[PDB]
């Protein structure tokens, strides 16, 4: 597998695994929502709104959107008094033959110029997975980040579970509105 269950509470499961040559573990969060797949797609489209629910987001803006792709700008906070780091993210929406929806996620540091006063997050990578249930949708959120930002790698690793846990919990509360 490589994976191992790291947390299970409030209906959410988070898996982690080592990635060779990195000091940061990859996570995979899992939750099941009473919503349709395209209800989560809408929320993930509304990047201007990330800051409203998505944890540790100080600010967010949609830069560009097509049918299949999107770019948004984020200013990230942190659980500790460290400088904020910002970044541009590329989402790519794919609908598989079976109605499963995959949103491929990718940091793109050079899309906009550096905003100086701020550290630019280096490449990140992962995806959301949205697969319909009889009555809802099964949600996967998986990310691996490389070294960068204002939070020591050793610190981000020891706290890596709280990112998908906090995100999925907030996306659940948020869809309920």
Choose one: 49-57, 66-74, 130-138, 163-171; the region binding Mn ion (CB under 5 A).
Answer: 130-138
Q: Residue 157 Cβ, how far from Mn ion at the closest point, in Å?
A: 30
Helix then strand then coil, in percent of the chain rounded to 5, is: 20, 40, 40
Any contact of residue 46 with Mn ion (CB under 5 A)?
no
41: enclosing H helix or E strand? helix 37-45
CA dihedral 170→41→133→15, nearest 10 degrees, is -50
Q: Considering only residues 9-38, where is the footprint of Mn ion by CB under 5 A?
A: 32
Choose one: 20-28, 45-53, 135-143, 148-156; the region binding Mn ion (CB under 5 A).
Answer: 135-143
Q: Which two tokens stand for residue 68?
A: 């299949």
Any contact of residue 133 with Mn ion (CB under 5 A)?
yes
Residue 83 CA, chain-centre distance (Å), reads 20
CA distance 144 to 63: 23
Which CA distances in Å does 19 have to 22, 24, 81? 6, 7, 28
- Residue closer to Mn ion (CB basis): 8 or 133: 133
Q: Residue 143 Cβ, how far from Mn ion at the closest point, in Å?
A: 22
- Residue closer to Mn ion (CB basis): 106 or 138: 138
Q: Residue 126 Cβ, how far from Mn ion at the closest point, in Å?
A: 21
The site for Mn ion (CB under 5 A) is made up of: 32, 133, 138
């Amino acid at each position: 597998d490589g994976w191992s269950l790291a947390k299970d509470a409030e209906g959410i499961k988070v898996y982690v695994r080592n990635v060779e040559g990195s000091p940061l573990r990859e996570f995979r969060g899992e939750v099941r929502l009473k919503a349709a797949a395209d209800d989560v797609v809408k929320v993930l489209r509304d990047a201007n709104a990330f800051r409203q629910w998505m944890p540790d987001v100080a600010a967010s803006e949609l830069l560009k959107a097509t049918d299949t792709e999107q770019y948004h700008y984020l200013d990230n906070s942190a659980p500790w008094p460290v400088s904020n780091r910002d970044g541009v993210y590329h989402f790519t929406y794919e609908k598989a033959g079976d109605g499963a929806i995959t949103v491929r996620v990718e940091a793109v540091p050079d899309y906009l110029p550096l905003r100086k006063g701020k550290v630019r997050i280096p490449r990140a990578k992962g995806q959301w997975t949205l697969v319909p249930d009889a009555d809802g949708v099964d949600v996967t959120y998986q990310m691996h980040a490389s070294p960068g930002g204002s939070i020591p790698s050793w610190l981000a690793n020891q706290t890596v579970v709280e990112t998908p846990f906090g995100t999925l919990k907030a996306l659940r509360s948020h869809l309920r509105q």
